[PDB]
Amino acid sequence: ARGVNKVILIGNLGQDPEVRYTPNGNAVANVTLATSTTWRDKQTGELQERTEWHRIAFFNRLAEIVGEYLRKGSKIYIEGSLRTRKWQDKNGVDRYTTEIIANEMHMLD
Amino acid sequence: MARGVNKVILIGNLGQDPEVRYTPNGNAVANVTLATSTTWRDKQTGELQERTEWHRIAFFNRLAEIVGEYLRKGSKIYIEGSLRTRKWQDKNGVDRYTTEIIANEMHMLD
Amino acid sequence: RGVNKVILIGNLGQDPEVRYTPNGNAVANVTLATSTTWRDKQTGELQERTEWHRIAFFNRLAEIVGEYLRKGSKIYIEGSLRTRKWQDKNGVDRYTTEIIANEMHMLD
Amino acid sequence: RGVNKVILIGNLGQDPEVRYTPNGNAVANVTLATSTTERTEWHRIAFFNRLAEIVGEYLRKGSKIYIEGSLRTRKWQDKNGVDRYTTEIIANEMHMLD
Numbered sequence A: 001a002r003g004v005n006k007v008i009l010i011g012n013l014g015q016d017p018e019v020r021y022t023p024n025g026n027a028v029a030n031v032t033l034a035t036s037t038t039w040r041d042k043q044t045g046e047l048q049e050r051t052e053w054h055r056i057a058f059f060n061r062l063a064e065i066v067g068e069y070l071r072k073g074s075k076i077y078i079e080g081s082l083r084t085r086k087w088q089d090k091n092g093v094d095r096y097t098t099e100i101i102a103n104e105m106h107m108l109d
Numbered sequence B: 001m002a003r004g005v006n007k008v009i010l011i012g013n014l015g016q017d018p019e020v021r022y023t024p025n026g027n028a029v030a031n032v033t034l035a036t037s038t039t040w041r042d043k044q045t046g047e048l049q050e051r052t053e054w055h056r057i058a059f060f061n062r063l064a065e066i067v068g069e070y071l072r073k074g075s076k077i078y079i080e081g082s083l084r085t086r087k088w089q090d091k092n093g094v095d096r097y098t099t100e101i102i103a104n105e106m107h108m109l110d
Numbered sequence C: 001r002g003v004n005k006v007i008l009i010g011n012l013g014q015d016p017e018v019r020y021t022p023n024g025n026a027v028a029n030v031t032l033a034t035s036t037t038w039r040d041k042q043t044g045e046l047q048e049r050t051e052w053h054r055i056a057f058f059n060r061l062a063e064i065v066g067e068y069l070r071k072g073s074k075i076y077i078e079g080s081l082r083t084r085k086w087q088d089k090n091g092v093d094r095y096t097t098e099i100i101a102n103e104m105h106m107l108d
Numbered sequence D: 001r002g003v004n005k006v007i008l009i010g011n012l013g014q015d016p017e018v019r020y021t022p023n024g025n026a027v028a029n030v031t032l033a034t035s036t037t038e039r040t041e042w043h044r045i046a047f048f049n050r051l052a053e054i055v056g057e058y059l060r061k062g063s064k065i066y067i068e069g070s071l072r073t074r075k076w077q078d079k080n081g082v083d084r085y086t087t088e089i090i091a092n093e094m095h096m097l098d
Helices: A061-069 B062-070 C059-068 D049-058
Strands: A004-013 A018-022 A026-040 A047-059 A075-086 A096-107 B005-014 B019-022 B028-041 B048-060 B076-087 B097-108 C003-012 C017-020 C026-039 C046-058 C074-087 C093-106 D003-012 D026-036 D039-048 D064-077 D083-096
Touching (some): A004 A047, A004 B028, A018 A061, A026 A061, A026 B005, A047 A061, A047 B076, A047 B097, A061 A096, A075 B048, A096 B048, B005 B048, B019 B062, B028 B062, B048 B062, B048 B076, B062 B097, C003 C046, C003 D026, C017 C059, C026 D003, C046 C059, C046 C074, C046 D064, C059 C093, C074 D039, C093 D083, D003 D039, D039 D049, D039 D064, D049 D083
Parallel strands (some): A047 A096, B048 B097, D039 D083
Antiparallel strands (some): A004 A026, A004 A075, A004 B005, A018 A026, A026 A047, A075 A096, A096 B097, B005 B076, B019 B028, B076 B097, C003 C026, C003 C074, C003 D003, C017 C026, C074 C093, D003 D026, D003 D064, D026 D039, D064 D083
């Protein structure tokens, strides 16, 4: 190639995997994944949880694995790549919707 | 010490010269658009063709300052950061995720 | 100018000992095991290879590790590679490569 | 099970050189320099097959590249048959930054 496009996530499945098949027997799976980090309340010192949400897509073998083993709550590790579909704002500002294309996946439960 | 891991690593070029602003308190804030390339093989003809993804990146404070001063359209950079997503609601009522990369690190690659 | 990153997930080989440096700082040296399993694409079959990594935790991270982690604990690590030079008893330069941990997350 | 991953960006210490293992395969062992505000770290990296050929063709001393790989420590004996150990990076992917 010439560029690097790489995401590493650890988080939980927000719902049970949704598995489907292309009209020619290809596995496709879509999951929602929540990753968390902590935040310190400045006033009170309370350690509070912050959550980001990500859409992940798996293909073929990996998608089969996902639907075979993973359920809501499942904690997994993931490497993948960002894929974005260009936008346009109410104010005409270019925006970016992002799915993660998964190439690796390690189960952690 | 968080329960999760949210890491992006990118290498690519600025589509445009950086956009920079300051907050009412002075602190800097920069955004750029990054193109990252890979290569696709045309299965029929064997042609080596370039595919491009586009990314919105936000920088803050000192990093933003560095970006304003040093970067330009075409600049090749390395980026470590985190994904920040604001949630959607689709035409067909499906959930979508609009993401910005929040940069923690930046190395210029000439 | 340069990137030196290591990401690992695997299990501790021992209960960690927090020690102190000749400068008074906490250190915890541990080993971590990562494994690759694959089937030989012809002759042999189910192959499994294990790698042992040397990890150095310093200061608070050292103390956390000393306090929470135990042998076999499943842990996640980000860090940097450092090789150091020492001498054997006959004065020959020998080398050891270690992961200087930046971050760690408990997966258990 | 387990993640063993390395990412580097730095420069080759020497013009790379394709050689061959006793199995016949291609391989280039090179060193890569990475630095921090200043201390320089030297990594042994190993490319095999295709990557090795590609590395041997296009890279010279001081070539800035990007690498992903896995860590591997192999065991060997010195003259006196004492177990010694070397940590090398087995590269999966490589990109030229020049």
